[PDB]
Symmetry: C2
Subunit: 587 residues, 2 copies
């Protein structure tokens, strides 16, 4: 009754600049950890020559890159913002795009719940000084405080709602999703942006190996392996857009998976060393999440573990999951994504949750890598869990696909969330052949051309995408920006041709160069221009003039254009951010 749908997703991880790259890497079992030479590391002069220094890390490509003009941010402010502020702000923009929701036109309350690492801000620059209360002081505070990582999203995306920032160490992503779902179930918001960000500073840096501790000795992470010595430190970002399941189905959204239940607790007085799971407290967390979503352990066929790669910590976590599943659970696939990318800190739980969501969406199970000798002490044949050594189709005897993801952190933080595969797709009516308007807008002309190239490339990969879904998503899911482009077409092949080249071969492009659009033809609505009659909305000349009026900069009511058909929102390419490098120069 309290299911929450994941209708948009955005992430960046070691070796992946977007979610499609991340899922493709997981499918092929790639390792995203980077190894450096001594001269490639320009910090830790005192440690670089130690025999225990491991020159390996999970780097985040473009951690210092940002496109402030798209957000209305000045260059001065972009350098003042911590890298976590910028990376999370850019991911929030992308997650609204992936769900095809224009924040300017969202009619409801949107909550932004995120988790961040305050240690990064303390290393990036000195904190704000509150000796005076001028507007330049407030700008500096909004650039540095972790409290405004979520607030700046509401402000710069044009949303209205509530913002909550939490700091929960290595359980950050799960705690954000947990609090977001409480906001939705109590009716405080209509949809929620939830995620976390982790940018380790210094970025290009190794670590010091110490025997018996969580950091790996060779730079490789080997979950559930007998020869595992730990993990690698990683950076990344992961954001999801959450919406109640009945509403997401009613609005014909694109659903990756649904959140059945979440649970949090703390080890408390029953404390362990770092990474060591206390069986009683962690199992209560795992069982509580399954109880919240009314799912029985017999129905959960995938378990995404924390999995540092240490024999003792991996053994305790598998034991805790066993206590929560019981004996009669059956069989379940177990894996740990940390073998692929390392320990991503605040967003470590996000890497597992995003992997499980895409696993449920594509009905595939990605492998766990760096596993050559199974840990005999765990005794997997005596447990419900089977290590996923190879990729495989997900066809459970249970009948339903459900996953559980666990996040462990320092300070005793525990968290577990349970996901279910998305609802079965409804039968679609055949697509009407009629002229449609498609729109693209960006900040400058060069970015619009990148959007056209990105859109044409996407069309080849997704040949089964309907045109009425494409136009509906582009027209109602993107912000209207100054440099604009539009076309009126009827088939997918016409769309591919007008996008090609300079993009000026379409009737709308030739219309705008010859004559200006006559607005007296249209009727004014509260949301913009509309056509005068229902018959006019199938006339090529009427639709061409309306699209040209939009290209000239007028506001068009796209809701009434698609009012007669029940199209679906689909996932389209993100904005092609021009990524200038920004870094503070004064401490």
């Amino acid at each position: 009754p309290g299911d929450v749908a994941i209708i948009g997703a955005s992430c960046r991880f070691p070796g992946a600049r977007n979610k499609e790259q991340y899922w493709d890497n997981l499918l092929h079992g790639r390792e995203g950890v980077t190894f450096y030479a001594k001269d490639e590391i320009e910090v830790d002069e005192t440690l670089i020559n130690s025999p225990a220094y491991v020159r390996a890390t999970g780097a985040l490509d473009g951690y210092d890159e940002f496109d402030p003009a798209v957000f209305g941010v000045s260059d001065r402010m972009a350098a003042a913002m911590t890298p976590e502020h910028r990376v999370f702000l850019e991911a929030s923009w992308e997650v609204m795009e992936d769900a095809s929701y224009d924040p300017e036109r969202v009619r409801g309350e949107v909550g932004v719940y995120a988790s961040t690492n305050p240690q990064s801000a303390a290393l990036y620059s000195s904190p704000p000084d509150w000796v005076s209360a001028g507007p330049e002081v407030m700008d500096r505070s909004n650039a540095w405080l972790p409290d405004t990582i979520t607030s700046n999203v509401l402000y710069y995306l044009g949303l209205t709602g509530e913002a909550v920032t939490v700091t929960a160490v290595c359980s950050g992503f799960h705690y954000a999703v947990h609090l977001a779902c409480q906001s939705l179930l109590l009716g405080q918001t209509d949809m929620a942006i939830a995620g976390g960000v982790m940018v380790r500073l210094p970025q290009r840096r190794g670590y010091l190996w110490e025997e018996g501790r969580i950091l790996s000795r060779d730079g490789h992470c080997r979950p559930f392996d007998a020869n595992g010595t730990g993990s690698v430190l990683a950076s990344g970002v992961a954001v999801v857009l959450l919406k109640p399941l009945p509403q997401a189905v009613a609005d014909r959204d694109h659903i990756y998976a649904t959140v059945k239940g979440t649970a949090i607790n703390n080890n408390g007085i029953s404390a362990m060393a770092y990474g060591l799971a206390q069986p009683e407290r962690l199992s209560a967390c795992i069982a509580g999440a399954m109880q919240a979503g009314d799912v029985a352990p017999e129905t959960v066929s995938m378990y995404e573990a924390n999995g540092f790669g240490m024999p003792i910590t991996d053994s305790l976590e598998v034991h805790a999951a066993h206590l929560a599943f019981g004996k009669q659970s059956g069989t379940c696939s177990i894996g740990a994504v940390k073998g692929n990318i390392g320990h991503a800190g605040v967003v470590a739980g996000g890497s597992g949750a995003v992997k499980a969501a895409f696993a449920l969406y594509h009905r595939s199970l990605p492998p766990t890598i760096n596993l050559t000798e199974l840990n005999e002490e765990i005794d997997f044949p005596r447990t419900p869990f089977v290590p996923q050594l190879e990729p495989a189709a997900w066809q459970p005897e249970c009948g339903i696909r459900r996953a559980g993801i666990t996040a462990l952190g320092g300070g005793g933080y525990n968290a577990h969330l349970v996901l279910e595969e998305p609802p079965r797709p409804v039968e679609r009516e055949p697509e009407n052949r009629r002229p449609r308007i498609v729109t693209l807008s960006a900040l400058d002309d060069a970015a619009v051309s990148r959007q056209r190239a990105a859109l044409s490339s996407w069309l080849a990969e997704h040949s089964d995408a309907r045109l009425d879904d494409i136009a509906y998503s582009l027209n109602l899911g993107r912000k209207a920006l100054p440099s604009r482009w539009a076309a009126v077409i009827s088939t997918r092949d016409e769309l591919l041709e007008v996008l090609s080249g300079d993009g000026k071969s379409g009737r709308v492009s030739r219309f705008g160069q010859e004559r200006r659009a006559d607005l007296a033809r249209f009727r004014r609505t509260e949301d913009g221009l509309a056509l005068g009659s229902g018959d006019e909305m199938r006339d090529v000349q009427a639709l061409t003039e309306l699209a040209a009026a939009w290209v000239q900069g007028e506001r068009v009511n796209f809701e009434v254009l698609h009012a007669d058909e029940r199209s679906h929102r689909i996932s389209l390419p993100n904005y092609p951010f021009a990524r200038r490098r920004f870094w503070r120069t004064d401490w």
Copy 2:
């Protein structure tokens, strides 16, 4: 005897990127202080809106620019070096060029004495950590420690001698020049590099006015004015090359001025507030400097004062100078360069000293600016000093031109140095009409082209420069660098012709493209290739082969080329440093 010659100079001050630009500004009474709008200052968020905040400073253009390849420095090391390390190192290279001395061919011991501000390094980056003793740690120490500002000059220029760094607050330049002269008079070195550097961090910054203090209320410095309220903070660098006067005349060097005497002391227990000159202690300093050089107060016709611009501080200094001059001194021109540029900290005494050296060299007196109401409390008609309101030719009733410069700082630091005009130029033998080789070398082709552009402009400005001096200075006073250019010409007008355009219209260019050089034509010497006869060294075709062999990278003995003539070293354009910005990214 005990007189020390200034045979080379290099400086950068507010509004001047080199000494020629600096003297031209002083001659025209220009002010080099910069005034900013609020949005142009990106620091001091807590103060930018205060009514007492003055958006004025003496900026040092390119304080972050460096050309590490010219010095053999890596990009990583260039970012680790503090701006004072880079600026002073670049200035030492320039002072060797200005004096026409190639460090590879200097046979003697060179001392490097500099003054620096340790406050600047502590603001630029965290200090080195000595928990281990690796080579990367040693590189970081040499990049940060003030002790290595002088060592890096000796190492990176290829010199051998001694290096001494002193910290004497706002009298740093004088203390460096003072110690250099003791080093020369005791015979420990043959030439000495002396100077100071001041790079204020943050650079683009205003200041806070406090009533009754040294900082100006409107951003203008008005020395000796009744309405003066103080000075502005400035950054800069000034370096001079010192050599005993009898040797400098013997080696036909280029002499700006000579140092007659120097003196230092401290206020000690008889302390004052900042900027206030104690009459008894400062006068003893001024009198001691003139006694060291055996100069009588009757002969000093120019006094360059500290002159903050406050009536009370100006009154104490003019009185202290009066006590040292006595009654029988006569009349003397008094001025303060701080009215032009502000208080340059470590190098403030250098800005006045460099002004005095150029005044003696050009036999001209530049005016003191921002002076509208003379301070009536300073009974100027009853003193030997006359405020230099207008530029004027320097023709003293004394018969000899001598100047005195005072530098005051915090902590009681006092210093005074007395300069004399250079010796009268001797009658020169007429210039031989013969073919000459001229050479230019840098690290890449674009820099060599900049050298050609700089030399073509210089030839127009200095139409009285002899061609045999130009060739002598370029061939024997500049380091041979990988990217090379040479020409064989007989007059100044053909020299201007080969430099023009792409520089490939010359005789040497056609030889190098046609054939590679035949080394069998030349005789090998310990200093490089030489021509077979003295007649060949005056043959256009033989000189072309020798020059082309040099452009191809062979070593040429330029000493035997000029052995028959006794030419002079002259001042030619400095290296055209590629202006890349380097700044640290991790604290």
